[PDB]
């Protein structure tokens, strides 16, 4: 029915990436993030910003020749947090209600058959 592209949302903490590409991936179409739509460092991840970046992305998305899109949501991953950032579901919620018909969305956070020593040491990191 529509013209399909790929949404692909990387939502870590301290920032959230939204950017749509051609269904193959090789050629992209507009990006914009949460760090872009506010200036305060501390407020780089928050849903409020992602919503704004969802808004910008939706504009250019339909500005070229895309009408619909499948999303591939994703946390940091690797030897890092493994859990979805705040402004990723909020970045998808603001992208869902924008006309761009969605379809089939899986998680793609890189998960290892574990290893490479995590950072932090025996004491560990964030507190």
């Amino acid at each position: 029915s529509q013209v399909f592209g790929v949404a692909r949302i990387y939502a870590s903490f301290n920032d959230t990436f939204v950017h749509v590409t051609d269904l193959s991936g090789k050629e992209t179409i507009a990006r914009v993030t949460g760090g872009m739509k506010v200036k305060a460092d501390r407020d780089e991840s928050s849903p409020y910003a992602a919503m704004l970046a969802a808004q910008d992305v939706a504009a250019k998305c339909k500005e070229v020749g895309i009408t619909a899109v499948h999303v591939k949501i994703r946390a940091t991953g690797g030897t890092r947090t493994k859990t979805p950032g705040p402004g990723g579901q909020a970045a998808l919620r603001a992208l869902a209600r924008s006309g761009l018909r969605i379809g089939r969305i899986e998680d793609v956070t890189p998960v290892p058959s574990d290893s490479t020593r995590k950072k932090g040491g025996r004491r560990g990191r964030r507190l």
């Binding site: 928050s46 849903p47 859990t83 979805p84 579901q89 909020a90 919620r93 006309g99 969605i102 379809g103």
Partner: protein
């Protein structure tokens, strides 16, 4: 002009949700106007949006979030809150994320979050207006962003092996400085 979102249902949380099902699907289909099918054989909930009966495009996305919230072992009332208030989000992390713990060390760690008779776990939610789920190695949080960030720091302080008292201190500190504002 349809839309189809399909969410898998966990077997452990499958029985309570199916039992309350009769309390579950009516607020969706009736209050939000939505199609809620349920495949028992595939254990998958299917949320479809009808253009004629759906006023808001976001409601279909909201319905999927509500099903997932209950999926994560949260209460039906907590799931209902997600539809009612937008500002409510869920955060999930692995104990192995914050501090690599083996065997009993992990076990005890979990207890420091729960506490005797849930007392340690209940205090954090009340002072942070949130809902927490203590699964296996996964912990889930449900509530406002500003509320969740304070709650996550308190939970992490516990998982780092800090004594419960200290965490009570930080807890009433934060709850005071936020309920004041």
């Amino acid at each position: 002009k349809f839309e189809s979102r399909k969410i898998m249902v966990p077997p452990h949380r499958m029985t309570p949700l199916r039992n309350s099902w009769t309390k579950i699907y009516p607020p969706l289909v009736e209050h939000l106007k939505l199609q809620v099918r349920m495949n028992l054989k595939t254990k998958s909930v299917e949320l479809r949006t009808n253009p004629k009966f759906t006023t808001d495009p976001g409601a279909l996305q909201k319905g999927a979030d509500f099903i997932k919230a209950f999926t994560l072992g949260f209460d039906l009332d907590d799931s209902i809150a997600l539809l009612r208030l937008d500002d409510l989000y869920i955060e999930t992390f692995e104990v192995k994320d914050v501090k690599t713990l083996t065997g009993d060390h992990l076990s005890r760690a979990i207890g420091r979050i729960a506490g005797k008779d849930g007392k340690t776990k209940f205090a954090i939610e009340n002072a942070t207006r949130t809902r927490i789920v203590l699964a296996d190695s996964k912990i889930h949080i449900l509530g406002g962003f500003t509320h969740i960030r304070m709650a996550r720091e308190s939970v992490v302080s516990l998982i780092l092996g800090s004594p419960p008292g200290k965490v009570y201190g930080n807890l009433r500190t934060v709850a005071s400085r936020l309920k004041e504002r």
